[PDB]
Amino acid sequence: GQWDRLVLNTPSFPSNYWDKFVKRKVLDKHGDIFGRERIAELLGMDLAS
Amino acid sequence: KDMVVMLLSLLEGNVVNGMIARQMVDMLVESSSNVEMILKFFDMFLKLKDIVGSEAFQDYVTDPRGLISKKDFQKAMDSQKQFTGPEIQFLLSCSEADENEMINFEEFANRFQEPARDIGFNVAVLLTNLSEHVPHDPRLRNFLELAESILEYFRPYLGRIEIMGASRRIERIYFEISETNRAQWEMPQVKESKRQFIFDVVNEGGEAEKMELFVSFCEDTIFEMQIAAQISEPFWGELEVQRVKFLNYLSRNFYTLRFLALFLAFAINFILLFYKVSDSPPNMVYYFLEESTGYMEPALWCLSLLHTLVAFLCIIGYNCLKVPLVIFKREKELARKLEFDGLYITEQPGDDDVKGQWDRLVLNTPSFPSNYWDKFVKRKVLDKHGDIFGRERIAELLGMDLASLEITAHNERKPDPPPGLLTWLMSIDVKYQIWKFGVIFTDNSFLYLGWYMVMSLLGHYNNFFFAAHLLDIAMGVKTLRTILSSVTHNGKQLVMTVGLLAVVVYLYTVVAFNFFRKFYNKSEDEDEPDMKCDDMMTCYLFHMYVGVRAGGGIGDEIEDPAGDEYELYRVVFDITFFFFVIVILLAIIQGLIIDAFGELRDQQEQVKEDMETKCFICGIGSDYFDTTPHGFETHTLEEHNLANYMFFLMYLINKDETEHTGQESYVWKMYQERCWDFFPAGDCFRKQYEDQLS
Amino acid sequence: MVMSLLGHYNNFFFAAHLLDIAMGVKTLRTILSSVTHNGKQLVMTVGLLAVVVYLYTVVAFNFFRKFYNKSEDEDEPDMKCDDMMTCYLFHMYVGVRAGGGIGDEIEDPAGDEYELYRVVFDITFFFFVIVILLAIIQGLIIDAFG
Amino acid sequence: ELRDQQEQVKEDMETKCFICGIGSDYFDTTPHGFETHTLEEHNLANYM
Numbered sequence: 001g002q003w004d005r006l007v008l009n010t011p012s013f014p015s016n017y018w019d020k021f022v023k024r025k026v027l028d029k030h031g032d033i034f035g036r037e038r039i040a041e042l043l044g045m046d047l048a049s
Numbered sequence: 050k051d052m053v054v055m056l057l058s059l060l061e062g063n064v065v066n067g068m069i070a071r072q073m074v075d076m077l078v079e080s081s082s083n084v085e086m087i088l089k090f091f092d093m094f095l096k097l098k099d100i101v102g103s104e105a106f107q108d109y110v111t112d113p114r115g116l117i118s119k120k121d122f123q124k125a126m127d128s129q130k131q132f133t134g135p136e137i138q139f140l141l142s143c144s145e146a147d148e149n150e151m152i153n154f155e156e157f158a159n160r161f162q163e164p165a166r167d168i169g170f171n172v173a174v175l176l177t178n179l180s181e182h183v184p185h186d187p188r189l190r191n192f193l194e195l196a197e198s199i200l201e202y203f204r205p206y207l208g209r210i211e212i213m214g215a216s217r218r219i220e221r222i223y224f225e226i227s228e229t230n231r232a233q234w235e236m237p238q239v240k241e242s243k244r245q246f247i248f249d250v251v252n253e254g255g256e257a258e259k260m261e262l263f264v265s266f267c268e269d270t271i272f273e274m275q276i277a278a279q280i281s282e283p284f285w286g287e288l289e290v291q292r293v294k295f296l297n298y299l300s301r302n303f304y305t306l307r308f309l310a311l312f313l314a315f316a317i318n319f320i321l322l323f324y325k326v327s328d329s330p331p332n333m334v335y336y337f338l339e340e341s342t343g344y345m346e347p348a349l350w351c352l353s354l355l356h357t358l359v360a361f362l363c364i365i366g367y368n369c370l371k372v373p374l375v376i377f378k379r380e381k382e383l384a385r386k387l388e389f390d391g392l393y394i395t396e397q398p399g400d401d402d403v404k405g406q407w408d409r410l411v412l413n414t415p416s417f418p419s420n421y422w423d424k425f426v427k428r429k430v431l432d433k434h435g436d437i438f439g440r441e442r443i444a445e446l447l448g449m450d451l452a453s454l455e456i457t458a459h460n461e462r463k464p465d466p467p468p469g470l471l472t473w474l475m476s477i478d479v480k481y482q483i484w485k486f487g488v489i490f491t492d493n494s495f496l497y498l499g500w501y502m503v504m505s506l507l508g509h510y511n512n513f514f515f516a517a518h519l520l521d522i523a524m525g526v527k528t529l530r531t532i533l534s535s536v537t538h539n540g541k542q543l544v545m546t547v548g549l550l551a552v553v554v555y556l557y558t559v560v561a562f563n564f565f566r567k568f569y570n571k572s573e574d575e576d577e578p579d580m581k582c583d584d585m586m587t588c589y590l591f592h593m594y595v596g597v598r599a600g601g602g603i604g605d606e607i608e609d610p611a612g613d614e615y616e617l618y619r620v621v622f623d624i625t626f627f628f629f630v631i632v633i634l635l636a637i638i639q640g641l642i643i644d645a646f647g648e649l650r651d652q653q654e655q656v657k658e659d660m661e662t663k664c665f666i667c668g669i670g671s672d673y674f675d676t677t678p679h680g681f682e683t684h685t686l687e688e689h690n691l692a693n694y695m696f697f698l699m700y701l702i703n704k705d706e707t708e709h710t711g712q713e714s715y716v717w718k719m720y721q722e723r724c725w726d727f728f729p730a731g732d733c734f735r736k737q738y739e740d741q742l743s
Numbered sequence: 744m745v746m747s748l749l750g751h752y753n754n755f756f757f758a759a760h761l762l763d764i765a766m767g768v769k770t771l772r773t774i775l776s777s778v779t780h781n782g783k784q785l786v787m788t789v790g791l792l793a794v795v796v797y798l799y800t801v802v803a804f805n806f807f808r809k810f811y812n813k814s815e816d817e818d819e820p821d822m823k824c825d826d827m828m829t830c831y832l833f834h835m836y837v838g839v840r841a842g843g844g845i846g847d848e849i850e851d852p853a854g855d856e857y858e859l860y861r862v863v864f865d866i867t868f869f870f871f872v873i874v875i876l877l878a879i880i881q882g883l884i885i886d887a888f889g
Numbered sequence: 890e891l892r893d894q895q896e897q898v899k900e901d902m903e904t905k906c907f908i909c910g911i912g913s914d915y916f917d918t919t920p921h922g923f924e925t926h927t928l929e930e931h932n933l934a935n936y937m
């Protein structure tokens with residue numbers, strides 16, 4: 001887990017694994033409770049983009 | 050909460066699709082809007098609590114005092130999106146906002162939790178009961194969905210069991226489980242005790258006595274729980290409180306002290322490896338360490354002192370932690386034997402029962418039921434057996450003052466004695482103490498600890514005695530314990546095999562003495578002959594000592610028979626020795642060890658298979674339950690959880706008797722009468738209501 | 744790869760690559776898995792053997808030093824158990840390997856006051872180490888097969 | 890082989906009636922049913 005922390009903010013996170021929308025799904029799931037901006041910072045997400 | 054209790058009392062004895070349950074559902078439907086309002090009240094405040102705990106709300110919080118503006122609160126809530134705008138307005142109205150409109154969200158959330166808890170739990174129980182007893186009603190589903198949050202919150206605290214009731218029908222019982230009880234159960238020591246109990250009952254436990262053993266395990270578990278609570282970390286009085294703190298610390302850290310003692314023993318022996326013996330000092334030899342540093346010699350003295358101290362501390366910790374359960378079980382079994390078996394009143398011990406002869410003492414002692422909860426066992430035993438066996442004789446046996454018994458009931462008396470050392474000494478009960486000390490000294494763990502202590506003391510006399518403490522690794526390590534249990538499993542057989550080997554070697558010795566003496570010279574010089582078998586005893590020692598150790602037998606170690614009239618007799622002698630002793634008997638030892646491994650393995654495997662295949666309570670197999678998906682898992686976790694049965698026992702104990710329901714009073718009465726028929730056996734809610742449920 | 748590179752430096756490093764047969768062959772993989780199944784138990788058994796040999800070494804040092812001469816010439820005595828460390832090494836190295844134990848490798852006790860103590864010493868060493876502990880290893884392997 | 894022989898004897902006796910041939914499951918449908926069946930209903934000592 002400590003190692004896996006790194007790849008989260010990386011753009012390439014779901015390279016081999018098919019699900020490329022996991023970040024948006026995780027955001028839609030947990031952003032109301034945990035903060036959208038914080039989820040985006042964790043996952044390397046540009047909300048404006 | 051009281052009204053809901055009345056409703057549940059109406060539901061007592063309800064069958065599936067019962068008229069009263071359907072009537073309750075119809076009433077709820079008629080009152081749907083207000084039911085919705087109540088459920089919404091509860092869920093809103095629960096979500097308020099979880100939100101305020103949420104860090105996102107803290108982001109909106111920007112004031113050092115910890116207060117929040119009403120506008121900021123509304124923005125936080127609309128960001129969370131759980132609440133509608135009317136709900137946010139109502140929450141703001143309930144919030145006590147100062148003239149500045151700032152709010153203490155902490156108190157705002159915590160205000161309604163405790164007041165609404167009991168009603169919330171009773172509502173959850175009501176909805177659950179109605180859902181299970183009316184499985185197919187669309188109208189109840191809406192209420193369940195609205196109560197989802199309440200049900201989720203109270204899920205860990207809702208305990209569900211099944212019993213066989215006076216209706217002669219399986220019945221489902223819902224009750225409350227306390228956080229403290231659940232945590233105490235989840236403590237690892239209780240988990241290990243449960244595992245050992247399961248192993249014991251499955252391997253060597255009968256179905257008839259399984260329930261009795263389970264109840265005894267639950268009671269012992271309760272005693273361990275209260276001991277753990279007592280030791281749990283939060284001039285005479287100062288001395289006593291510091292003493293209690295020290296003893297509680299020892300009880301809590303007993304195992305750590307054991308590991309520390311192991312570490313010190315290992316270090317001491319590592320140092321001892323450096324010892325050397327010389328004729329000269331650094332006609333008698335001198336033993337001394339050989340280390341250039343000069344620091345290890347003081348270190349050995351210090352380590353010996355600390356190891357000795359830790360052994361003493363471990364003994365004290367054992368006395369404080371573990372002996373209470375030993376005495377509790379001993380007192381309990383004696384009390385049950387008196388009340389139900391009527392042992393010392395009618396039967397008397399076999400006279401080969403040292404434990405009974407010893408237990409005779411504590412009966413007349415006042416302190417008899419010290420650890421064990423039942424303080425009225427003497428009066429109960431008297432009321433039971435006094436008409437037949439004589440009240441005065443029962444009182445003499447049990448140290449009872451009949452005149453005092455009635456006056457205690459007549460009037461309450463408080464002859465409190467002022468605290469004094471002399472008063473404490475007079476109070477001490479020497480006979481009960483002697484009985485306790487006998488029990489403890491018979492206890493094996495205490496004996497091993499005392500031997501540990503004594504060997505450390507002897508190590509202070511001669512440091513090499515400390516090596517014995519290295520043997521503690523067997524008890525310290527489960528792996529070595531099991532490996533050695535492989536040997537112990539067949540130890541009697543191994544000893545008998547060794548005796549048989551002795552007998553065969555003795556017969557071979559007889560043959561050699563009478564016929565083969567000439568061959569046993571072991572001296573190179575002819576002038577000085579060393580003959581082993583001129584004496585029987587010496588011949589026997591020679592055989593048992595050299596021949597058994599030799600791969601080829603004694604023929605390896607004695608003179609060649611070539612060119613002798615007895616050559617063929619001796620070749621038979623040697624080959625038969627080799628095959629019977631070196632090959633077969635050894636083979637017997639190897640095979641006994643291997644079979645011990647297999648037996649232990651199949652024991653664990655059998656325990657696991659039985660638990661995965663059957664309910665510990667029902668006795669019903671996993672196949673019937675798995676007819677429904679995940680049915681066995683649901684049955685074990687929810688329907689027939691043994692931990693839930695234990696929690697029910699605790700809940701009954703802590704609940705007032707006037708407050709018990711019919712079900713609870715029924716089960717409690719069977720507990721007191723030690724009747725286990727309320728436990729379901731061969732029946733379940735599903736099986737009873739199969740046609741209706743499906 | 745690294746061992747091949749080192750083989751280029753010294754050709755004998757290439758022998759390590761012969762160990763690849765275990766992963767190459769399912770049969771050897773299973774046979775070795777028989778050992779691995781109970782490897783922790785085997786290591787603990789070895790440690791226990793070390794402990795028992797250490798205790799026997801202690802007894803020999805305190806009581807049975809005279810018997811541990813291994814020099815033929817009287818002028819030059821080679822005594823193994825004048826030092827604990829050396830006594831422990833001697834035991835663990837010769838006695839365990841010996842079928843009859845350390846008594847096979849040390850001086851006969853006949854005509855000595857400690858003769859019976861030493862016969863007990865030798866027989867108990869033989870039974871506890873040569874017979875039982877080894878037996879534990881064999882049985883662990885067999886149980887792994889089963 | 891000797892161990893599994895004794896174990897098999899024990900399992901068979903605890904699982905079936907020496908007389909009926911019926912298993913303990915059917916009887917344990919009723920509580921303690923197998924024990925009652927063996928002691929009272931179909932005791933071989935009672936047959937003797």
Ligand SMILES: Nc1ncnc2c1ncn2[C@@H]1O[C@H](COP(=O)(O)OP(=O)(O)OP(=O)(O)O)[C@@H](O)[C@H]1O
Pocket residue numbers: 660661663664665666667685686689690691692
């Ligand atoms: N009446 C019963 N009550 C509870 N468990 C039962 C019962 N009958 C059979 N079982 C089996 O008991 C097992 C209980 O699991 P167990 O307590 O051993 O879990 P664990 O691995 O120690 O971890 P944990 O309890 O923390 O999840 C369940 O798998 C279930 O198969």
Ligand SMILES: Nc1ncnc2c1ncn2[C@@H]1O[C@H](COP(=O)(O)OP(=O)(O)OP(=O)(O)O)[C@@H](O)[C@H]1O
Pocket residue numbers: 902903905906907908909927928931932933934
């Ligand atoms: N038809 C049967 N009649 C009697 N016993 C049966 C029968 N079928 C199976 N059994 C089994 O036989 C066992 C009889 O017990 P057994 O005679 O071996 O007891 P014990 O340990 O020798 O002691 P004791 O008879 O003194 O209580 C019972 O446990 C029962 O499970």
Ligand SMILES: CC(=O)CCCCn1c(=O)c2c(ncn2C)n(C)c1=O
Pocket residue numbers: 264268271422702720721723
């Ligand atoms: C219920 C049974 O047979 C085992 C006894 C242990 C349960 N139990 C009690 O019943 C009890 C009690 N204190 C008062 N009472 C009536 N404690 C502590 C207890 O464990």
Ligand SMILES: [Ca+2]
Pocket residue numbers: 707708709
């Ligand atoms: Ca009442």
